[PDB]
Amino acid sequence: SERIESFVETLKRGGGPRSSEEMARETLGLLRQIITDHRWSNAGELMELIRREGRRMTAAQPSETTVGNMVRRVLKIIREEYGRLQLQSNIIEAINELLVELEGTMENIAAQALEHIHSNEVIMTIGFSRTVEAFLKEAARKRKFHVIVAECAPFCQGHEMAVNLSKAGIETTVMTDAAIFAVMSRVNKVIIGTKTILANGALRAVTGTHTLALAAKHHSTPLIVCAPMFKLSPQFPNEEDSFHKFVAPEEVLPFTEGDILEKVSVHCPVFDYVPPELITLFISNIGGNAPSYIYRLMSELYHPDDH
Amino acid sequence: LIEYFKSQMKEDPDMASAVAAIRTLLEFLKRDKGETIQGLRANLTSAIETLCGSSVAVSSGGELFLRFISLASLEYSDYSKCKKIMIERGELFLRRISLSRNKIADLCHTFIKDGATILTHAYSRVVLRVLEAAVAAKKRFSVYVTESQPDLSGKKMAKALCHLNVPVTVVLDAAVGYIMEKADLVIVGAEGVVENGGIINKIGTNQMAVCAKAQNKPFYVVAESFKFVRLFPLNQQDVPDKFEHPWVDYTAPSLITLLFTDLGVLTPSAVSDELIKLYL
Amino acid sequence: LIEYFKSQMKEDPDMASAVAAIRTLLEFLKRDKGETIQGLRANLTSAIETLCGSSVAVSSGGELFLRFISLASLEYSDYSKCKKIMIERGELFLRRISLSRNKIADLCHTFIKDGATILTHAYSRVVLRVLEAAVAAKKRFSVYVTESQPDLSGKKMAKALCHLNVPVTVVLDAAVGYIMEKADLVIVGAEGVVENGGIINKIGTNQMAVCAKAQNKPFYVVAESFKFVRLFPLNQQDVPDKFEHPWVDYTAPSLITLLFTDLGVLTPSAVSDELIKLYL
Ligand SMILES: O=C(COc1ccc(Cl)cc1)N[C@H]1CC[C@H](NC(=O)COc2ccc(Cl)cc2)CC1
């Protein structure tokens, strides 16, 4: 039915499912359903329906790149499926296989953790991500390091993670965002989680990632950005200023203190821009690929209908 | 054949001479005897005979269509081999090379920054194609150029660009430093690209690009699908015999940012995958 | 006075353009009325009237001898003040400025590296004085030059240097990149030096020196005791009105290595001590 319209409203109003397999499980859901019973013509009228419902879905808040990402990957499975080509059986089966493969990202991307962090090694991360916390929790069967976590990004959603870590693990300290250059003279091995990563090799992340990565390639310490698959976005950074989320400036200035709020301009960006000239490894779901290789990995997944 | 190729490029305001040489060796590859293997070696001698003249791209097309024709040894036949299928396959390949610049422009157009001051040190064809489409659908931008001293060829871009009706200034080639404080998005085309993603163009390019990644502005390059050679230098004064008389210089791939090609948009460390995908 | 100064520098194959103005204001400071304080302000108007013409060093000498004459207000007198003692004191300040270059050479000579390839982008007087003494007592060295496009004045150094009988090549000013792989110990003279130890010279200097501290070769500068101004820029396009028409450029003191002066050898962060020792 048209419950997708509710879904089309659901992404419209906001209220995030954490990006933790809700966006992907849902997009796989609706694509499974529209794939299941709809109009049928042989010559990619299903694919045309995928383009229509696709561009209608991408008409949501243009930041949830996972939605269009798994949309496009469904299209590539359609193209290879016809390439080898009862097609609905093969297509829905292979989509089921992609679902089951998607069902294990946060474990296998967290197995490869003992081979990086060593004893007595002051790691450092900004913001909070499910994968970086799960990833760092499987390195609690090794020695006691520190963790320095920045309290950035008002609204500063940083701490919950310092709770969820400290009461289970290593001695974490919490620094304000405005002290990331007295620290980072006494550190090594920075990690950051990624909101989405671009074709050229860029990280679009939380609103303090830049000014931090600059410190990494100033003191020459390597920064990993642990990020799973399905978040390799095409469309190299051409579209400008729709690259973000501008939120209400109530979060940065209070509605109190009248009259000053007549003539003064408040800005609030949610994301930022990390260029590929500063990232020094990607830990990923299948391999461990470098920055400058990321290009062909994208060509491994998609097809030139990247629009 | 020399008068034939010179005749082909004489009546041509576009379709670059490296390209003209391709059609020249196409027709002079058609009307010759010896439908056999070693007869192609005679064309190899013609590949030297065409290479008489400079202009590295000519040798690039030489090995290019030399490999394109040379791939017909596989799918083996006798006296009527599928290089004759690469007469129209090739014609298709020549029209494939002919329609190349349009895709480079349609990809490239978007990166202009709507209030940008594009700098260029050349007189390039495809730069003017893409930049002409850029004004022909989109915002405004200034352009600064400097003139290459042993051609003054930048002024040709000054004239033809003034026919494109956009505000141009052009300062001399000694004071590029003074230019770059007031500039962004440096764009240049290129004669050839070596196997690690480095450019060779006119004899002033590195004198800028060394100054490009000091004031942190980007530096793009753009070329068609014929500048990929197997050559590999490692220093200046290690270029081949292709030059007060130098003609081309070298820019290391630790400076060239995202480049453009007929295969699509590209990063400066994926060219090796293309050429190693081809040559072996 | 204009014909007097132009007359002074017309019959002069050496001497400073600045030194010519210094003697001009010396004699035209001698033969004038108003032996008083405010009469000096008339000379200040003459300081503007001399400053009619460019060439920043002229204003430098203007404030220089303006302060040298101006220091005679201390040790106070009336109508026969010790600026008249700075007629011969000054005269010997003018011979003090005249014998300046010889000390700069006698200090400077040693840094030539006996098999060196000295690069220079100019036509300087004192560079040729020191380099002439350098061959005139010591080892051998090549020299590379490039020609400044709106004077071609480098070729004057090519000619006069060939009269000094050392092997010179001279390439054009676009391919300095191609030069620096085969070069060491870049030497340039300078018109003016700003208060943080930065140089202003011809309109190509930064286009090199940005490339000097990338291939890690040093970069010296050398000037007499008359280029110290109180001026202080902080960016390009923030130079004063002293300029396809720029004439001078700027090189930040994070690039200039050990420089030479009539006070002695000097580091690029001790100039401020000299001028602040003087001006207050
Ligand atoms: O314990 C801390 C905590 O310091 C901070 C934590 C957080 C912040 Cl914001 C600031 C400081 N720092 C270091 C102290 C040395 C130790 N390492 C060693 O004791 C080992 O020393 C070595 C390691 C390798 C070699 Cl080759 C030689 C000595 C790592 C942790």
Curated annotation (Swiss-Prot), chain A:
GO terms for molecular function: ATP binding; GTP binding; guanyl-nucleotide exchange factor activity; translation initiation factor activity. It comes from the Eukaryota. InterPro entries: eIF2B_beta_subunit, IF-2B-related, IF_2B-like_C, NagB/RpiA_transferase-like. It is found in: Cytoplasm, Cytosol. Activated by the chemical integrated stress response (ISR) inhibitor ISRIB which stimulates guanine nucleotide exchange factor activity for both phosphorylated and unphosphorylated eIF2. Keywords: Cytoplasm, Disease variant, Initiation factor, Leukodystrophy, Protein biosynthesis. One of its GO terms (biological process) is myelination. One of its GO terms (cellular component) is eukaryotic translation initiation factor 2B complex. It is linked to Leukoencephalopathy with vanishing white matter 2: An autosomal recessive brain disease characterized by neurological features including progressive cerebellar ataxia, spasticity, and cognitive deficits. Brain imaging shows abnormal white matter that vanishes over time and is replaced by cerebrospinal fluid. Disease severity ranges from fatal infantile forms to adult forms without neurological deterioration. The disease is progressive with, in most individuals, additional episodes of rapid deterioration following febrile infections or minor head trauma. Belongs to the eIF-2B alpha/beta/delta subunits family. PANTHER family: TRANSLATION INITIATION FACTOR EIF-2B SUBUNIT BETA. Component of the translation initiation factor 2B (eIF2B) complex which is a heterodecamer of two sets of five different subunits: alpha, beta, gamma, delta and epsilon. Subunits alpha, beta and delta comprise a regulatory subcomplex and subunits epsilon and gamma comprise a catalytic subcomplex. Within the complex, the hexameric regulatory complex resides at the center, with the two heterodimeric catalytic subcomplexes bound on opposite sides. This is Translation initiation factor eIF2B subunit beta. It comes from Homo sapiens (Human). The gene is EIF2B2.
UniProtKB/Swiss-Prot annotation, chains B, C:
It is found in: Cytoplasm, Cytosol. The keyword Acyltransferase does not apply. One of its GO terms (biological process) is response to peptide hormone. Coiled coil: none annotated. GO terms for cellular component: cytoplasm; cytosol; eukaryotic translation initiation factor 2B complex; membrane; plasma membrane. Activated by the chemical integrated stress response (ISR) inhibitor ISRIB which stimulates guanine nucleotide exchange factor activity for both phosphorylated and unphosphorylated eIF2. Keywords: Acetylation, Cytoplasm, Disease variant, Initiation factor, Leukodystrophy, Protein biosynthesis. The modification N6-acetyllysine is found at K30. The keyword Metal-binding does not apply. It comes from the Eukaryota. Pfam families: IF-2B. Its main location: cytoplasm. InterPro entries: eIF2B_alpha/beta/delta, elF-2B_alpha_N, IF-2B-related, IF_2B-like_C, NagB/RpiA_transferase-like. GO terms for molecular function: guanyl-nucleotide exchange factor activity; identical protein binding; translation initiation factor activity. Component of the translation initiation factor 2B (eIF2B) complex which is a heterodecamer of two sets of five different subunits: alpha, beta, gamma, delta and epsilon. Subunits alpha, beta and delta comprise a regulatory subcomplex and subunits epsilon and gamma comprise a catalytic subcomplex. Within the complex, the hexameric regulatory complex resides at the center, with the two heterodimeric catalytic subcomplexes bound on opposite sides. PANTHER family: TRANSLATION INITIATION FACTOR EIF-2B SUBUNIT ALPHA. It is linked to Leukoencephalopathy with vanishing white matter 1: An autosomal recessive brain disease characterized by neurological features including progressive cerebellar ataxia, spasticity, and cognitive deficits. Brain imaging shows abnormal white matter that vanishes over time and is replaced by cerebrospinal fluid. Disease severity ranges from fatal infantile forms to adult forms without neurological deterioration. The disease is progressive with, in most individuals, additional episodes of rapid deterioration following febrile infections or minor head trauma. Belongs to the eIF-2B alpha/beta/delta subunits family. Acts as a component of the translation initiation factor 2B (eIF2B) complex, which catalyzes the exchange of GDP for GTP on eukaryotic initiation factor 2 (eIF2) gamma subunit. Its guanine nucleotide exchange factor activity is repressed when bound to eIF2 complex phosphorylated on the alpha subunit, thereby limiting the amount of methionyl-initiator methionine tRNA available to the ribosome and consequently global translation is repressed. This is Translation initiation factor eIF2B subunit alpha. It comes from Homo sapiens.
